[model samples]
Target: MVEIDPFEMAVKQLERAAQYMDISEEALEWLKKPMRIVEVSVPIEMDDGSVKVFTGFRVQHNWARGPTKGGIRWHPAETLSTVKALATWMTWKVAVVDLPYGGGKGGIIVNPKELSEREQERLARAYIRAVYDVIGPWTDIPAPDVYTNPKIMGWMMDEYETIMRRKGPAFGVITGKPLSIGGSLGRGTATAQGAIFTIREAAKALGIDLKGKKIAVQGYGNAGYYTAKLAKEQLGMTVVAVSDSRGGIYNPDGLDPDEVLKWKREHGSVKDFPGATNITNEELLELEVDVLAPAAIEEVITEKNADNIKAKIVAEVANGPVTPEADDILREKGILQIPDFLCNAGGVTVSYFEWVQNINGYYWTEEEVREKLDKKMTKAFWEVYNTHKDKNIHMRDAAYVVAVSRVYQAMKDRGWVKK
Candidate 1:
């Protein structure tokens, strides 16, 4: 196995999409790199009163459509290159959903789990302080990503407001905050809820009823848990299996998502949930099911496993869960792949909604938020689906065509790219 250059892979993906459109070399060149990358040194006091300086970054991929938006990831393996790649994808994601925003991402190279809660809060606030001048409600907004959550977001928002000394709350500076603040009603389940909506449309387009369909979810995190719960609760689907990092559990008779979630909370893993039989993550992916959602990590579906996938639909709830080669294989095997960006745009869409509520200082109920999100997700799915049919390309390619075309037009209109 060889280490892949994430940034280069990202550019290659863009180049692949460019071949379908009549884009200029100059525009392609401009889109290849991020508009700005800010590096900061965050020195925070550890629990032992020792000072530890962490390297942090905020990469703004593009802003032609509107202010940039993305998540702040706290991981020990965080890198500028990875952030750049993710930021680039964020641009296309917002475009795919027709949101009035561009793409940006932030990261700190530290494991939040290893730190005390107070230290984590210190680091979040310190990172915001170091990059305070480069981020804001109207500039670039950051939300929660891997290892970072609403509490961290709340701290960042409070720190930004403290720095700005505004008369009102600076809730717009960040999203994914707890409900006491300006967090949107459906923000927590936005990603899963959004994906479910698209799945509904996909089923309808295929002339298949969702009732009694079997869904196997890979990864039991936020998106994965909600995906199982909503599928079973809303669509009357049967959850046959679910996996976490440790392993997976399967029960063809059906596993209750709520029960599994409760077991995971108490036992630290989903593998031993009552009557479900234990299985590896690899085996879970190959399980015969109506819908197989890879919601955990990247490249889980490659050439080796693509031929073995028995699901009619592969809903990518996680980013880059299927490689390009696997994508081709899945297509040949007649698997309807909901591309990662399009499948996961629900989180970003709700983030945009949170921003709107913050700016207006008005909040919407969960029902209102869910209704709006359904419309946006449904519209985005069909737009990409239509492109897939019209251009005779893969769903991933169609998604890129729709998103890249939008970003390219915005750049041309803003005079960044020539007409």
Candidate 2:
């Protein structure tokens, strides 16, 4: 919608990832075209007793590996391109993380803030009704993403079950639910925790210890804040700077993640914290820190300011944060740019665990979940690292090579295509 073709932006990166191995053009063609997608018109009753119509979409990019898995995002600027890109990313994310699932994504164009609690629930249920035939516990599962929380997921799951008239324990139908439901223990921090593991492995490879290292995080949302807190509390890293949609704050020494987040909740910004220098988001991104994490939005590290980045490692927690052009520049600078699909696959990995738990009527403790996540992420990092070493490519390229190769193999194994 904004002149950027999101799906094209996503598939274009596979060009480099595809060069590492022999892949047929027909196979690549099949991968580019989505297996199924549905665009629906959803009507909701507003709090003022007025009827409002919203646009919704469910895109299952591929089902070669298994049933598709992804999240639903509710936003005012939601576009079909964004969903297409996200669904494509999920395909690679699961492949890299070695999850036995494919890719899918859903979204609706509505500002949740403008709706009341009841109205929001109504919209959530309406979306489920529109896409119920295509989604199931074992078919295409949905999780939480931008502007979508557990309560909304609960409402979706409920609506789905009522429509099916099955009282079975179908907690696997939706993930990121509350603990009282089928939600996994570490679902809240799985994305950040997974990225933390990759950072740890990268620190070891860079021959730099993580303890007391400086990290500046852009976008103080759930993922950003958790990255700061977990990095400080668990890894003893010194988080020197953090920013939100409003602005940012910095301290040469350190900024306590918990205390800063508390202040942010009260003041609606992290800019005016005591004993910290105020800075803009651009300034924060350009800060000369050991690690620079872009967890906010896509295209933050484009060609315009790619050279200004000074971090040794650019951990992309947000999908498509670095453009392909900027990626070349960063690689030229010898910066280790961890791709988003590899770095943040922890959420979907745990979502897989939750799905398995739902099928078996079992759940693990939080510590167990964290431990398993560490093992999976550590293994994945080394796999990509070995590919980087063997192929002599950038870390981003290496990650894509591993994930894209896996996806290619799966599609070929299923006879989805033939050379």
Q: What TM-score would every model get versus the actual structure? A: 0.94, 0.92
Query: What would the C-alpha RMSD of candidate 2 be, to one decimal place?
Result: 2.4
State the lDDT at 364 in candidate 2: 87
lDDT tens digits, residues 1-419, model 1?
68788899889988878898888889889998898899989999987768999999999999999999998888888888899998998898899999999999989899777888788888988998899889888888888887877877888888888989996548888888898977788777888998899899999987788889899999999778999999888999999999999999999999989989888888898766778799998899878899889899987888898888898888888878888888778798787889888888888888888889989888899899898998898989999898888879899888888898898889898887665
**lDDT for model 2:** 0.86
Model 2, C-alpha of 240: deviation from truth (Å):
1.9
Q: List the residue pairs that clash in candidate 1.
A: none
lDDT of 1 at 79: 83
CA shift at 334, candidate 2, in angstroms?
2.3
Give the least accurate 10-residue stretch of model 1, judged by summed lDDT: 167-176
lDDT of each: 0.87, 0.86
Compared with the true structure, model 1 gives a TM-score of 0.94
- Expressed as tens digits, the lDDT of each residue in 54-122 for candidate 2 is 999999998888889998999998888889988888888898878889999999998899788899889
For candidate 1, what's the RMSD?
2.1
